Design a protein around this ligand. Structure first.
Ligand SMILES: OC[C@H]1O[C@@H](O)[C@H](O)[C@@H](O)[C@@H]1O
Length: 455
């Protein structure tokens, strides 16, 4: 077990995020926020204008549809809004796993999948959700990819991230593409808003809590949005919003700094990915990648340190075979025999069985990987708070969403703890991390509700 332990120790050390490194990252993040707001091409942080200069207040009422395209899942929903006291009276939704072939196929095919699913959902309208005869359906479109926004309800795709690669779609208007698809299925919908999922989550949180100033997604991918002062955005002067505010989609997944604790496994993951050199921060934080970092460490232990015996298990060679929900399960195991770790490894990798020593290393690996991702997330949030100048009783709330933060308890608890550590005793009480909802989707509908053409 000597060589295995040597790899583990080295990995542990290389992944280290002491409080000093987190401060360095937060500062680097804040610098890049200024640079990305200064000019369109001056930073790894795109800092995209959302054209959302006003967030939902809670008094919104009516019937609204929302559409949410993520990296792995697609969601359609409709809500009935009843104002300040009733809020969300009723909500109906469906979720569909995106067929992997659609992620790298053609543009029309993807939008057809979206429109066809929506048309089936609309067909189930009844009772409370029946469309009033003299009205049309109003829709908020959550699109979880970088978009060059041209208005509240228009913008073109900058690039794909996560598992997606449809080169045909790059530079095309996303709303226009959806509109064509809706027309292909004969569906009539007014698209009231196009928002990134971070922006949707921000609107969802603000709807319930006036103190919400930013939103963070920790799911398949990672990103953050926040409310910036319009005057503090030198690169942009389209609208002159009465609010003096403008929500920014940071696209922080693309953040890179020399301060990032990268390892050889991160480098090989990146070098062999769909988008080499891009989304560097996301590749060490988000759910798509955490399990893949684990697989690559285990693969090296298997190849060079006989971790699984004399032969490398074939399933260990399949990229993304180990997923973050597996990690969550294993990490959570406190049994003396580590029976959950043993069961999961055996199911995924198809190995005969695992000794306790093997299970200890795996869970140690899970903790190292999750802890690095969680602590860097906290540094990013701290970076946002610095930008807002909030590092009295000017309470700041961060709305959270995503499968990592929602289901991976060790991860979420570590992130919050690290953030409060960065804030320190004095400033700790001024910042709060909140909830989740299905905010990405619901938020887009609430934004549509703010811009409804009906009374
Ligand atoms: O879903 C969270 C994030 O995933 C990233 O890969 C995308 O580039 C962002 O647009 C999105 O906000």
């Amino acid at each position: 077990w000597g060589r295995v332990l040597a790899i583990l120790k080295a990995f542990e050390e290389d992944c280290a995020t002491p409080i000093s490194k987190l401060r360095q990252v937060a500062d680097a993040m804040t610098v890049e926020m200024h640079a990305g707001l200064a000019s369109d091409g001056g930073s790894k942080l795109k800092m995209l204008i959302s054209y959302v200069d006003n967030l939902p207040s809670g008094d919104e009422k009516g019937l609204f549809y929302a559409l949410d395209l993520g990296g792995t899942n697609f969601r359609v929903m409709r809500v009935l809004l009843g104002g300040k006291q009733e809020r969300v009276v009723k909500q109906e939704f469906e979720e569909v796993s995106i067929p992997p072939h659609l992620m790298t196929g053609g543009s029309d095919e993807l939008f057809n999948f979206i429109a066809e699913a929506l048309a089936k959902f609309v067909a189930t309208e009844c009772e409370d959700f029946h469309l009033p005869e003299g009205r049309q359906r109003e829709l908020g479109f959550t699109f979880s990819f970088p978009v060059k926004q041209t208005s509240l309800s228009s913008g073109s795709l900058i690039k794909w991230t996560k598992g997606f690669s449809i080169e045909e779609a790059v530079g095309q208007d996303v709303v226009g593409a959806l509109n064509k698809a809706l027309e292909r299925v004969g569906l009539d919908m007014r698209i009231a808003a196009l928002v990134n999922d971070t922006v949707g989550t921000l609107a969802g949180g603000r709807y319930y809590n006036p103190d919400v100033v930013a939103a963070v997604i920790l799911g398949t991918g990672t990103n953050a949005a926040y409310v910036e002062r319009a005057t503090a955005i030198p690169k942009w002067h389209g609208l002159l919003p009465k609010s003096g505010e403008m929500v920014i989609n940071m696209e922080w997944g693309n953040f890179r700094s020399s301060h990032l604790p990268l390892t050889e496994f991160d480098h090989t993951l990146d070098f062999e990915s769909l988008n080499p050199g891009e989304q560097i921060l996301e590749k060490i934080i988000s759910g798509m990648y955490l399990g893949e970092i684990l697989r690559r460490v285990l693969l090296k232990m298997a190849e060079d340190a006989a971790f699984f015996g004399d032969t490398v298990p074939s399933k260990l060679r399949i990229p993304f075979i180990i997923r973050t929900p597996h990690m969550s399960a294993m990490h959570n195991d406190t049994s003396p025999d580590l029976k959950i770790v043993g069961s999961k490894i055996k199911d995924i990798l198809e190995v005969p069985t695992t000794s306790l020593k093997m299970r200890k290393v795996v869970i140690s690996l899970c903790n190292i990987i999750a802890t690095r991702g969680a602590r860097l997330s906290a540094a990013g949030i701290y970076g946002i708070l610095k930008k807002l100048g909030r590092d009295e009783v000017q309470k700041s709330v961060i709305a959270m969403d995503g499968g990592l933060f929602e289901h991976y308890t060790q991860f979420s608890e570590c992130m919050e703890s690290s953030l409060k550590e960065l804030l320190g005793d004095e400033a700790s009480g001024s910042v709060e991390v909140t909830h989740s909802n299905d905010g990405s989707g619901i938020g887009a509908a609430l934004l549509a509700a703010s811009h409804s053409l009906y009374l």
